[PDB]
A paper describes a structure:
Structural comparison reveals that the ASFV topo II [name] domain shares a conserved overall structure with its homologs from eukaryotes and prokaryotes but also has three characteristic regions, including the intra-molecular interface formed by the ATP-lid and QTK loop as well as helix α9, the K-loop in the transducer domain, and the antennae-like α-helix at the ATP binding domain.
The crystal structure of the ASFV topoisomerase [name] domain was determined at 2.20 Å resolution in the space group P31, with four [name] molecules in the crystallography asymmetric unit displaying highly consistent global conformations [root-mean-square deviation (RMSD) value of 0.1 Å for all Cα]. The ASFV [name] dimer contains a primary interface mainly formed by the side-edge of the GHKL domain and locked by a long N-terminal strap from each monomer, which buries a roughly 2,000 Å2 of molecular surface per subunit. The N-terminal strap from one monomer makes extensive hydrogen bonds and hydrophobic interactions with both the GHKL and transducer domain from the other monomer, which contributes greatly to the stability of the dimeric conformation.
Numbering used by the authors:
A (entry chain A), B (entry chain D): 1 to 335, 341 to 403
Write the structure that this text describes.
Amino acid sequence: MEAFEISDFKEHAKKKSMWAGALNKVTISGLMGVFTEDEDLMALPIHRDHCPALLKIFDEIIVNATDHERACHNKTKKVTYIKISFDKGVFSCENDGPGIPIAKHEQASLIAKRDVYVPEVASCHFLAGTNINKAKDCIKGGTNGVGLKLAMVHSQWAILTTADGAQKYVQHINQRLDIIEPPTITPSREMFTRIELMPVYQELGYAEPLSETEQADLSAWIYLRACQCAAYVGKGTTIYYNDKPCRTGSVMALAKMYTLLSAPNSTIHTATIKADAKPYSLHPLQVAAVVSPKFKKFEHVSVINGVNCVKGEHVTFLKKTINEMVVKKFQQTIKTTLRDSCSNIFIVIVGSIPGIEWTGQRKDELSIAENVFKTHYSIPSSFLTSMTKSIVDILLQS
Amino acid sequence: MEAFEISDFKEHAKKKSMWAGALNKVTISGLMGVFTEDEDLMALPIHRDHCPALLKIFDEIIVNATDHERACHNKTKKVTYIKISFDKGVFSCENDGPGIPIAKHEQASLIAKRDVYVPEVASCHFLAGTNINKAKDCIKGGTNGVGLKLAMVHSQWAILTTADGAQKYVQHINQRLDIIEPPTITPSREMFTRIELMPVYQELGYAEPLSETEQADLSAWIYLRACQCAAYVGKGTTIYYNDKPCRTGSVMALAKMYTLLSAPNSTIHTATIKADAKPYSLHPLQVAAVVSPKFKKFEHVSVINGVNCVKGEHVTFLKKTINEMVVKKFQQTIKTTLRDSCSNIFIVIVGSIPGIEWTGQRKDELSIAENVFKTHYSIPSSFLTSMTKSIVDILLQS
Ligand SMILES: Nc1ncnc2c1ncn2[C@@H]1O[C@H](COP(=O)(O)OP(=O)(O)NP(=O)(O)O)[C@@H](O)[C@H]1O
Ligand SMILES: Nc1ncnc2c1ncn2[C@@H]1O[C@H](COP(=O)(O)OP(=O)(O)NP(=O)(O)O)[C@@H](O)[C@H]1O
Ligand SMILES: [Mg+2]
Ligand SMILES: [Mg+2]
């Protein structure tokens, strides 16, 4: 029929929500940003509709930088900084460490029948990257060879700049990937990767120059995402947002930021969840939790493999384990459901998990057998005991 | 680098969880199937790890049939049946109504430099279908031109059979899309579409001949999915699973099936939620709810646009509206959070919603502005008042 059609990747990415989510403004459950009060960092909800695909432009590039930080963290040449910028609608992200290799790609050059270099494949070729054949134990968030191309397809203009210690490579990628300019290659001896772009705000439902509220909301969201990165990356990396350092290097700092308005001056339960055997034993999970009667439902913030995912059995592992102990102790005083006993918890979980699978390119949800945690991971009893004490005291008051 | 690679669609679909979910067995929260007790239909949880991509093979084909049912419901030639079969691991789904057009695809033929017909494009060409340029008011679940190809890529062998009144078209698509046999085309006046396939069970983590428990679990899951279809499709369509008619033509029947074990002989609150203007006015939402103290947490079953999605503002619309009334009525007696007053609700929501977006190919979550429901839809107050009365009686007891 006339309606039966074949689409290419770029046209498909511009009209289909499967890649990065809705391409218009919708209600985003739990949307948050960070707002600065005095010199205090405070995470607050953003109760306005926003475009999920727009936020994924930023996220895809950000997770690419923290993926690189993970890859070189045990190598001689490492990532020391991730600089994120957002000004006048221009978004940029730069990291040091080895750049994308500046070399001709023979297969791509043969397909295109012209000289095509690796950074053009990295940025303009769908289903292309270094994680197509990812190992079980690889804890990079990246896996599909898709994310950077999504960022390009939603850019009015974009500039990729990378240097591998020998040369510098600059390439203009404009008009939602319609116009790929030939690269400019020079000698350099510098080493970094920078992505700078202007998203297609108007197509995504925003004011052509962002409105004051849109700009403030988007700036707040990116800043919180940079703060989440700062708690995830290794000991040698500093995260910057609009040049200032991000002061949330630990899950304690994240938990305080998220509960400053709710429950200031509260106690922060901490745990380092370790595993007995490799590869899991290489990746301890950091956890901080606040327990308060002021919280009216269970909430978590997860940064897993650099990704701010919202659903996963890693959360349930903590919830069920805590509930088991709460039920026990509570019964001794009376002599309660899973949401009961967890309704007063705010918990932050940050770390790497080998072998997880994702539910889509957005990586909203990770997928795994629950028994991975039961067999391999141990939650410190001191954390469980003080969490249970705090929760039981609240239950006894009502 | 050596690791920098370019992948094609089918190799990508076989390695990457983004298309259909995890490609191995993982824990699936809320996994259910239907099991027959006496002659009663009873939906029970399946507490065993299962492969999400495997279930999506079935789901993609099923939603293709209910999409056709919706497309032909107001036309002279309509869909009168959807027959789903699962036996000896062989899965098949057949619907009547107009078949896939048996016609040469010039563009596809030019690309391939051989005769390629429309049903081969429909089943073997990624990013291809009749919904690439989807209208905002189109309530079909299909949108990406991807789902049928995922089913083929996870089949050891498959047979597409379609007839359009003029001809019949039979085509063998084998070895995870590696071997596409030329079609056999004959004169016919039959009109239907059938997909029959053997999934790659072993590759997805199952026993080569399915084990007794695996077979029983998978049959139960498909049967429940067929029962959900029976509540969704139009009045002129019968759904069959393994030749038996599916006896859940209403949200009442669905709600009774899901609450038979927990709360038999309970009252079923019903509502038909209508909207003031088109396109929403064309698609009333059917709702049934059971309220019981035996219910531990809030649960919903959603069939939206034929899709059994698990997250969406359509649920929150009902939750917030009910909570508002519960808060008022409760305060009058005392003179309570959102977790409260909704913790004892099991609710079934079935219907079509125009203009929704999805968060991925799996269509786990739909995306929409909350204000669509606030401005356009009204929940009948009789349903709100009897739901509120039932909930307040429970809260007053404890
Ligand atoms: N900041 C960076 N530094 C170094 N290499 C990078 C950087 N960003 C991207 N790359 C490379 O470019 C490739 C393509 O990136 P991308 O399209 O995001 O795919 P991916 O990160 O591998 N998987 P995904 O994001 O899940 O679709 C990556 O695999 C890396 O090889
Ligand atoms: N049972 C069927 N009867 C008639 N036409 C069908 C049937 N199944 C598939 N088709 C057609 O085949 C096309 C390709 O199917 P499919 O690949 O599932 O894409 P889709 O349903 O359009 N979108 P999606 O499922 O979101 O990836 C559809 O768009 C329909 O035109
Ligand atoms: Mg990436
Ligand atoms: Mg489909």
